[PDB]
């Protein structure tokens, strides 16, 4: 079973569960066997006392949330809010500290507004990418959404976690506009213009007046977000996805050099993604279809996969947006930036000879169509879980290839296949390492945990820091931001103790604890 | 003279001034007659005990700032930070509360970095738009800056106040990336990746890890910003400014309807500005050159000015950016959106027959060239000060014209000329009212103060709220954001008391006081 959270009497916990049950009704308080949906689905720990949720409560309304939060204060019980809790590779729905009651906000799934003239939506945390896409299609509205690679997750939760997608609206939190928040004391606030009664501008103007605070409720335990606005891209007048491939692994140095001017200037309109061979292949193939051995793939097999699949060692999947004349012009600039590189190949969808193909999968993603089929890389090695590591770096060939060499060697010494991606947002490069592992085998869990720790350690030392991580690694990633004896987190701790003096909101999120657990 | 701030002994103040003088050296502590630079230059109050600064201290370094702040705590003296304090129409350098020691950061004017590959700058608060433009030109770097209408002011201070400009980088705070902050206790923090020692990514990636807090130091008294990064637009491959004019005052309803789709989609790349006749004329003419009477201008004079100056009743000044093919395409969409409106006229600079002309002034602004000559509207009526009122509204003809009728009537009943502007950022319309008044005449001060109060009152009631205001009106503008008995400001007060328990930072900025003055 799961243990009580330290400092919390068994009487006080059962008093809390009863008063929660009055608030949401007895049907919506979960214990015992009902609680396995809220486990980490991709186990990393070998210790079964860690990241174990104790109960779940699922309110219907903002006001029920406040009532819980007030109760949680009275009995000093901690809560762990999830919008839908489909945060795979980050912990799923599970809390950092054991003993935590999960506040599940699935049921709060109303789409309050979708406005076509102004290109926005106002949504509760329960609304998924699938629900929002389907609503938009059904009503015939000319708006695109921006989806991660799995659309069963939360428009809100993903944005609060600094999620990304693959359209020009790829920076989810950046497109957030207006929120309603239940503070850790149980008071309700609205940010920006929503603080102004009678406004029709909540989702039109981010700032409102005075200190801009939306951001303090992202990657945070300073409040529970119960409503959130997000800007939506008007349907454009044109759309052309492409794939550029490169033959050699060393190609990533010059390729990254040429993306810099294109990205900084905005000639490329979405995030640029340059994916390694195995990461792309694993969408439509598995390792055992190409190699017998338990080890990572030898070079000769890599060549086979390249020739079969029409993929390079690096694969740049992008998309043009806008009227055909603009697209033609941007394409001339993009293509010309890469033409002189030996081995380079350029494809539009018509030129892909396979009808089950990387480019045809990612054409859907790059126009905001949510889909299940990215999760296919999970099957590369017979079926397991994934871990991601995605630190930030300057957009430089030299930083690109250093990260590639550093990571690929260690991943491969550990017997995993190198699956990596060079992503660029706007001025920021991320080298994303994804490691598929057997979540059911404790010997591979020990291996993966150690590998992850080392990668983080070696990346930080070169200046590369993580921006989003798994519940398990939250403290570790916090300790990377340590300038002036951890001055930043001390300020976080100061705000935490002011908004949450009893520390009853997600103790340990982003490595923020509060005075009682510190 | 100026009075001591309430609650502060005369001994304690002179102890503070001495220990400040040890910190920055005696040359850099200002009293008595040295203190008139830091008065409000555009007097609104008739009471000479209000917004009166008591002393000024001008440190050299971040560490001097911290020392002051620690001293300020010991003796409970309040500080009012200005970067350069050239905040005209908002109070200049003056504090809301009297008695406040001005912390002047002019001397901290080093440009720490300008990076061409990555399109950013790292600047101290003392750096003006003029200094940054001149540095960029001198070193030959292909970067544009984004300037307000007066470039003698602070890249930092303007961004912290939510300032705007007229290029695609018009949203200044939005382009902010990374800051160093001295907290009200005197500790120093860096946000985002700057918290990570050895980073080369401080100005490349906004968020870093965990709660995003940059925004809490804008329009705020939660800290003193001592360094700040800002993204800079790479020099584009082309640039074509334009002016579209319209004959009738009612034209602003359809004009605003057609801008909506263009702005939401981003076809117009900079903020759209549609300026009333007098606001544009006053750049190159004065009232007395057209009309004798003390009143506002009659219609017959308006017609004269239109025919002389080749200006309409509304004037849409915009600019295309990028390679000629993209510009041609965007122009076709823009022009076609307006062609069917009776009286419409379209001009590029070549088609302006005057060599001292609105379009040739604003061509400079819309490519990031700082210039003095906007301040010319100040001379319309013989020379005075300005007040601005710029609330937010949905991008709607109906909201545009309601605001026009509401404001123009009252401004004109009060004997001022209607000078207004319809601006659009991205999804946000602002009706900006600018009122030029005689700052030296107390009867016109009473009039302007009353008018301003009424405008605010009538605009709020229709859903339109102010986002930036004069020191004098800060409390009033705060009280507009009152949903749930002022729940938002109560949270601001909570964070204020946690970061600033002794309340020694800009008491009253954005209507935030702290527990000792509340
Ligand atoms: C194969 C694979 C591919 C993926 N691809 C992508 C991708 O392309 N892009 C991407 O962004 N992600 C991606 N992810 C991660 C994940 O799938 C999505 O980000 C997912 O949408 C997040 O889960 P969710 O939306 O349910 O958010 P939630 O689980 O609801 O929220 C995530 C976290 O945010 C916090 N939180 C949530 N709601 C609130 C609230 N109301 N108040 C306060 N805090 C709150 C909590 O701490 C929670 O743990 C991928 C994962 C896998 C395994
Ligand atoms: C005719 C006219 C035209 C104008 N046109 C424009 C325009 O086009 N666009 C525009 O944006 N503005 C415009 N303004 C307003 C003003 O000219 C500029 O915004 C100006 O640059 C702001 O003053 P500053 O840059 O010195 O900032 P400061 O005076 O240094 O700062 C403004 C405020 O920010 C806060 N602050 C400053 N530095 C710090 C710090 N380090 N830490 C904490 N708080 C701090 C303070 O409360 C200060 O009062 C105009 C004004 C006039 C009169």
Author numbering:
A (entry chain A), B (entry chain A): 2 to 519
Reported in the publication:
Enzymes of the vanillyl alcohol oxidase/p-cresol methyl hydroxylase (VAO/PCMH) superfamily are found across all kingdoms where they perform a range of metabolic functions. These flavoproteins share a conserved FAD-binding domain and a more variable substrate-binding domain that enables interactions with a range of substrates. One of these, the 4-phenol oxidases/dehydrogenases, catalyzes the oxidation of para-substituted phenolic compounds.
We further studied the P151G mutation to assess the effect of removing en bloc the side chain, and P151N and P151T to test the introduction of hydrogen-bonding groups. The P151G mutation was found to elicit the same oxidase-activating effect of P151L whereas P151T and P151N conserve the properties of a dehydrogenase. The analysis revealed a consistent pattern: in the oxidase mutants, the 150-153 loop conformations create tunnels that lead to the flavin re side.
